[PDB]
């Protein structure tokens, strides 16, 4: 492990054969910057500021998975085929500030020790899929080589309006629900 | 009954300690969870972190543009990039929303960065506190309860020119 | 204009 | 010399025609790249591709394409020739599609002399 | 995006040294200095490439001055076989090559 006031990821550099499919992202204390959308070939910032003050090619961030794609093609032959193992996620509900009854608020549900990355993330209300409304961040890295992802869910707390935030992984024996209510 | 994957992660790693004083960058080639190989710029070579890794670390250690690029980054990427975080990141201060709502419940919410004290007539020893929580938005949470006058909630942030004050009764 | 963010790039494994 | 080698060293075709160039780059070198060298443009890049997949494009017309085999032999294609055409073709070569310190290798070129 | 400036052509005096000049005002913190030599009619041919110290090299030696805003190819002495069109390139990353008009080095007996 290394100490330091700041941790930044100039990127994230992901390749997998599910798929396939890549991720290219830059992070900064643990907080995603920017991603590259590798099949519209654009970058997009997290942040109004970024947007408006930062600019990255993403020609660069098509290239260099097309070097992790050859990368990983040699490491499958060297391991002798050695395929990932499915962890186990660890999911939590949360709001992202204090409930008020009829004051829009936002659901936060935190998917942990993701791997591989490749995960179903929905919502639930009052037993029914949710589909206005949600988003979530890429897929954010860790130490051990894992990822966790965030979904949102922006609502109206209100009373008989139950939710749920469903997640399916190869990790896991069933898709894996998350309670919460007011 | 699931299906096979393989997974490969590269990780451009910056380290920035005191200013622009300390600066130290970790390359990362993971194959699955396991790091095979890695270049740190206080070691400066390439070196095999698993029996995986010598035939890459061997090779890329044998290429001197391999090696003049990767001890350039240093400067290539995290020296420059720094300059682009003290103009837009570090210079984001988001002052947070301070609220009491009864147990005793001061709830600290959307804030940046992480830096926060929060403090409880005198302040009390007996308080259950979250830890810093970290909702993805780059804004932070922080709840800190109390059990059982005028109760005071004091907030500490650097985006605060004063610490906020929130009263109940 | 805004100034181009740096990346690091991956070394490529040997083909051979 | 750099080990890029280059066929057919000069060319000479009617207009409206079509010419298939091919490059071979050194061995181990995964990326390759076309340049057209005119009296009226200059040295203008036209394609790169790696590992068979096409990586970077330049001001390249419709009526020129380009491939890479899995021998990572390039051909470049230029069909409905024109007197402008008229050209040097260098194809080059490098290890990775590109880094600020890696060193491109240029083959001996194709002389295509595009006439009425 | 950030391009070069070169002499369009430079006469220089067999045996005496050469110093081919770059303007480069508008370079980035990510881009690295090329120069790529090309002789009549054969292909473009690397000659030597830096970042921001002076580089030293069997062909030739490549200074860079302290804003980075400009370089200099240096040949410590001129050759017949020297006289070739001589190519002040920028790079960064994968981006692609632009050779631009280059300088075209004339040396005289």
């Known amino acids: 492990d290394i100490v330091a006031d700041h941790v930044a990821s100039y990127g994230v550099n992901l390749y997998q054969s599910y798929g396939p499919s890549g991720q290219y992202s830059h992070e900064f204390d643990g907080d995603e910057e920017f991603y590259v959308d590798l099949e519209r070939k654009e970058t997009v910032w997290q942040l109004p500021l970024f947007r408006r003050f930062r600019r990255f090619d993403p020609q660069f961030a098509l290239t260099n998975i097309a070097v992790l794609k050859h990368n990983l093609n040699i490491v499958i032959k060297r391991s002798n085929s050695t395929a990932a193992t499915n962890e186990v996620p660890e999911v939590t509900v949360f709001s992202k500030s204090p409930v008020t009854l009829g004051q829009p608020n936002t659901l936060i549900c935190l998917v942990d020790n993701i791997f591989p990355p490749v995960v179903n993330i929905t919502w639930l209300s009052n037993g029914h899929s949710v589909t206005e409304g949600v988003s979530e961040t890429s897929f954010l890295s860790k130490s051990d080589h894992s990822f966790f992802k965030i979904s949102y869910l922006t609502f109206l707390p209100s009373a008989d309006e139950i939710y749920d935030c469903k997640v399916e992984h190869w990790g896991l024996d069933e898709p894996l629900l998350k309670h919460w209510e007011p | 009954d699931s299906p096979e994957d393989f997974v490969y992660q590269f990780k451009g790693m910056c380290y920035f300690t005191n200013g622009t004083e300390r600066v130290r960058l970790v390359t990362r080639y993971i194959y699955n969870r396991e790091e095979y190989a890695r270049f740190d710029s206080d070691v400066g070579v390439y070196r095999a972190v698993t029996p995986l890794g010598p035939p890459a670390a061997e090779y890329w250690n044998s290429q001197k543009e391999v090696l003049e690029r990767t001890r350039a980054e240093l400067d290539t990427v995290c020296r420059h990039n720094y300059q682009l975080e003290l103009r837009t990141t570090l210079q984001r201060r988001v002052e947070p929303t301070v609220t009491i709502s009864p147990l005793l419940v001061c709830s600290v919410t959307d804030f940046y960065p992480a830096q926060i004290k929060v403090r409880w007539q005198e302040e009390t020893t007996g308080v259950v506190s979250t830890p810093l929580i970290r909702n993805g938005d780059w804004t932070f949470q922080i709840l800190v309860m109390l059990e059982m006058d005028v109760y005071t909630c004091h907030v500490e942030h650097p985006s605060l020119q004063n610490p906020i004050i929130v009263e109940w009764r | 204009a805004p100034s181009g963010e740096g990346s690091f790039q991956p070394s490529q494994e040997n083909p051979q | 010399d750099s080990g890029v080698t280059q066929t057919p060293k000069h060319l000479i075709t009617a207009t409206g025609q079509r010419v298939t160039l091919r490059c071979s780059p050194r061995?181990?070198?995964?990326?390759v790249y076309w340049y057209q060298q005119s009296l009226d443009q200059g040295l203008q890049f036209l394609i790169q591709?790696?590992?068979?997949?096409?990586?970077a494009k330049g001001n390249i017309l419709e009526r020129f394409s380009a491939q890479q085999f899995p021998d990572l032999h390039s051909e470049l294609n230029l069909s409905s020739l024109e007197l402008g055409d008229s050209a040097l073709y260098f194809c080059?070569?490098?290890?990775?599609?590109?880094?600020?310190?890696?060193?491109?290798?240029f083959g001996p070129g194709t002389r295509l002399l595009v006439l009425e | 995006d950030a391009k070069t400036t070169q002499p369009n052509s430079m006469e220089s005096n067999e045996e005496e040294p050469v110093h081919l000049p770059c303007n480069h005002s508008?370079?980035?913190?990510?881009?690295?200095i090329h120069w790529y030599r090309q002789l009549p009619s054969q292909g473009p041919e690397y000659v030597i490439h830096?970042?921001?110290s002076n580089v030293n090299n069997r062909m030739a030696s490549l200074a860079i001055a302290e804003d980075r805003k400009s370089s200099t190819l240096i040949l410590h002495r001129a050759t017949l076989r020297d006289a070739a069109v001589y190519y002040c390139?920028?790079?960064?990353?994968?981006?692609?090559?632009?050779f631009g008009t280059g300088t075209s080095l004339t040396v005289i007996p």
């Open positions: 080059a070569s490098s290890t990775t599609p590109g880094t600020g310190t890696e060193t491109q290798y």
């Open positions: 061995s181990g070198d995964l990326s």
């Open positions: 591709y790696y590992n068979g997949e096409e990586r």
């Open positions: 508008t370079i980035s913190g990510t881009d690295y």
């Open positions: 830096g970042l921001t």
């Open positions: 390139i920028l790079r960064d990353r994968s981006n692609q090559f632009y």
